[PDB]
């Protein structure tokens, strides 16, 4: 009964329409992204939020672990591991290429690709990456990735939206998109605006284009940025801080008031020192106390002004907490505020933030990375740089998901103090509940090369003849 009319009317007028999220979003789709870009470019809080998002979802490094389903494919485990290590070696020598050749723009690496994609998905709702086959023979690989901002993809010539051609997205009857109408660069704003249509999928089974976002309900075609519930309060708070700073400025500026029937020049000379004997009225030499002798009929009223911060700190606390709730990030890391909080409280905050970040990582960055990894893998296979197992029951096209099964590791949870978590991990290993690859992943490493490096280290220590390390016999 609450949703009917409310107590004493109140919401006698609040009857928002009931329609699909696409119907409620697409007409103002451009405006929302425009305002989001404005905030992210000219707002400190937004820049902090996006930087924290990228640095926690991905961080400095983002590595691969290729775990094909050998059991399903009927392949020997040793052959599966050999293929996995060979493809990992090729992938690692390809991804960290200094020329940024993975990008046609040739200015960003793979981790930069992932971070930029997740950031633009954050402040736009979605990410677009296309794969291209160049004719350049300088490299063993001809597939490169190119980013597309959501602005570049829209209805060609701003044509009216239809049942299937929505915002430049051509969708079949069922509800799965198949074509995009991207637009070329908008700068400078005098060349003719051109459009190019691209199918999401090449006829041969290779993902020519990928568009990643998480929907909220059926029929959704475009993502919604995280600012859609916060942006108005964000800009209002910016205006508040601006006007409060102006008010503090003027209140501090105006301090004293002179009252006298005398001509202003002589009044300044006889009261505020002045130097008229030698525009901007007259400069005042800042010197000693200079007690004046104002005549009856004069006033030297010193304005006590007013306190600069009358509750603005508490207001920023409350509004930043609301913004943190809207953004899904903890207020502490959001506002660089960590006062009056205990160790347990800080750990709880970091825990929930890390859980949200791990979910977001898996559902955005992991999916994008897997898609681009299989896109590179198909080219590698067709290029024959790696040889498929002979006992392969199913073809690569059939077992594309099975062949390309892999997971990803980003920056680990650098916890509050280190010692307690590392000793609890060690005792987990002692008790046999966790496992080496699990904990080394949670730390950001891979047990395979960890073991290889430890073998190398102990071989070096044996050669130098100093001491066997903590791994021998």
From residue 191 to residue 230, the character string flagging contacts with other proteins as x (rule: CB under 8 A) and all else as - is -xxxx-----------------------------------
| Least distance to other proteins, CB of residue 171, Å | 18
Give the whole-angstrom CA distance, residue 108 versus residue 103.
7
List 7, 19, 261, 302, residue binding other proteins (CB under 8 A): 19
14 binds other proteins (CB under 8 A): no
Report residue 394: phi and psi, to 5°.
-120, 150
160 binds other proteins (CB under 8 A): yes
158 binds other proteins (CB under 8 A): yes
3 binds other proteins (CB under 8 A): no
Choices 164-172, 186-194, 203-211, 253-261; region in contact with other proteins by CB under 8 A: 186-194
Give the whole-angstrom CA distance, residue 351 versus residue 413.
9
Q: Which does 65 bind (CB under 5 to 8 A by kind): a copy of itself, other proteins, none?
A: none
Q: Which does 415 bind (CB under 5 to 8 A by kind): other proteins, a copy of itself, none?
A: a copy of itself
Helix%, strand%, coil% for the chain, nearest 5: 45, 10, 45
Three-state secondary structure readout of 256-294:
EEEECCCCHHHHHHHCCCCCCCCCCCCCCCCCCCCCCCC
What does the chain come to in residues? 473
| Least distance to other proteins, CB of residue 164, Å | 15
| Least distance to a copy of itself, CB of residue 182, Å | 10
Question: 132 in helix, strand or coil?
Answer: strand
| Least distance to other proteins, CB of residue 17, Å | 5
Give the whole-angstrom CA distance, residue 67 versus residue 70.
8
Question: 419 in helix, strand or coil?
Answer: helix
List 6, 27, 175, 292, residue binding other proteins (CB under 8 A): 27
| DSSP string for residues in 34-56 | HHHHHHHHH-HHHHHHHHHHHHH
Choices 105-113, 188-196, 224-232, 285-293; region in contact with other proteins by CB under 8 A: 188-196
Residues contacting residue 25 through CB under 8 Å, at least 6 positions apart: 32, 222, 224
Q: Which does 122 bind (CB under 5 to 8 A by kind): a copy of itself, other proteins, none?
A: none
Residues contacting residue 265 through CB under 8 Å, at least 6 positions apart: 274, 276, 281, 282
157 binds other proteins (CB under 8 A): yes
Q: Which does 192 bind (CB under 5 to 8 A by kind): a copy of itself, other proteins, none?
A: other proteins
Give the whole-angstrom CA distance, residue 373 versus residue 119.
20
Q: Which does 222 bind (CB under 5 to 8 A by kind): a copy of itself, other proteins, none?
A: none
165-166 and 143-148 as β-strands: parallel, antiparallel, unpaired? Answer: unpaired
For residue 146, the cross-strand partners are: 130
159 binds other proteins (CB under 8 A): yes
Report the first-to-last Cα separation within the chain, whole angstroms: 75
7 binds other proteins (CB under 8 A): no
Give the interface with other proteins as residue ranges (CB under 8 A): 15, 17, 19, 23, 27, 157-160, 188-190, 192-195
């Amino acid at each position: 009964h609450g949703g009917g009319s409310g107590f004493g009317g109140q919401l006698r007028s609040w009857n928002p329409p009931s329609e699909s999220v696409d119907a409620a979003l697409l007409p103002n789709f451009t405006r929302g992204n425009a305002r989001a870009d404005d905030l992210v470019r000219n707002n400190g809080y937004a820049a902090n939020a996006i930087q924290l998002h990228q640095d926690h979802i991905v961080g400095s490094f983002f590595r691969l672990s290729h775990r094909p389903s050998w059991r399903y494919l009927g392949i020997g485990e040793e052959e599966a591991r050999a293929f996995s290590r060979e493809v990992e070696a090729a992938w690692k020598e390809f991804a960290e290429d200094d020329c940024c050749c993975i990008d046609v723009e040739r200015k960003r690496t793979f981790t930069m690709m992932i971070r930029e994609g997740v950031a633009m998905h954050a402040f736009n709702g979605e990410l677009f990456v296309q794969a291209t086959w160049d004719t350049s023979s300088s490299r063993l690989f001809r597939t490169q990735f190119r980013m597309v901002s959501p602005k570049r993809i829209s209805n060609p010539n701003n044509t009216g939206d239809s049942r299937n051609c929505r915002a430049g997205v051509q969708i079949n009857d069922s509800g799965a998109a198949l074509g995009y109408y991207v637009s070329e660069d908008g700068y400078p704003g005098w060349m003719p605006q051109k459009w190019t249509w691209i199918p999401r999928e090449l006829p041969g089974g290779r993902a020519s284009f990928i568009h990643v976002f998480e929907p909220v309900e059926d029929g959704q075609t475009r993502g919604a940025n995280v600012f859609y519930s916060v942006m108005e309060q964000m800009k209002m708070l910016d205006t508040l801080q601006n006007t409060q700073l102006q008010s503090a400025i003027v209140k501090a500026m105006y301090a004293a008031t002179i009252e006298s029937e005398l001509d202003t020049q002589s009044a300044m000379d006889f009261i505020l020192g002045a130097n008229s004997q030698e525009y901007a009225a007259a400069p005042v030499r800042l010197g000693g106390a200079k007690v004046p002798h104002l005549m009856p009929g004069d006033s030297l009223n010193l304005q006590t002004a007013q306190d600069t911060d009358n509750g603005y700190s508490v207001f920023e606390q409350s509004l930043l907490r609301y913004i943190a709730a809207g953004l899904g990030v903890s207020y502490e890391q959001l506002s660089r505020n960590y006062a009056q909080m205990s160790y347990s409280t800080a750990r709880a905050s970091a825990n929930e933030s890390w859980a949200y970040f791990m979910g977001r990582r898996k559902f955005v960055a992991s999916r994008q990375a897997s898609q681009m990894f299989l896109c590179w893998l198909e080219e590698a296979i067709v290029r024959r740089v790696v040889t498929l197992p002979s006992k392969a029951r199913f073809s690569f096209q059939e077992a594309r998901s099975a062949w390309g099964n892999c997971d990803w590791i980003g920056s680990g949870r650098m916890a509050i103090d280190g010692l307690k978590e590392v000793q609890e991990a060690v005792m987990l290993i002692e008790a046999g509940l966790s496992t080496y690859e699990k904990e080394c992943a949670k730390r950001g490493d891979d047990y395979q090369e960890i073991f290889a490096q430890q073998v190398r280290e102990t071989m070096e220590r044996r050669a130098a003849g100093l001491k066997p390390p903590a791994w021998a016999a």
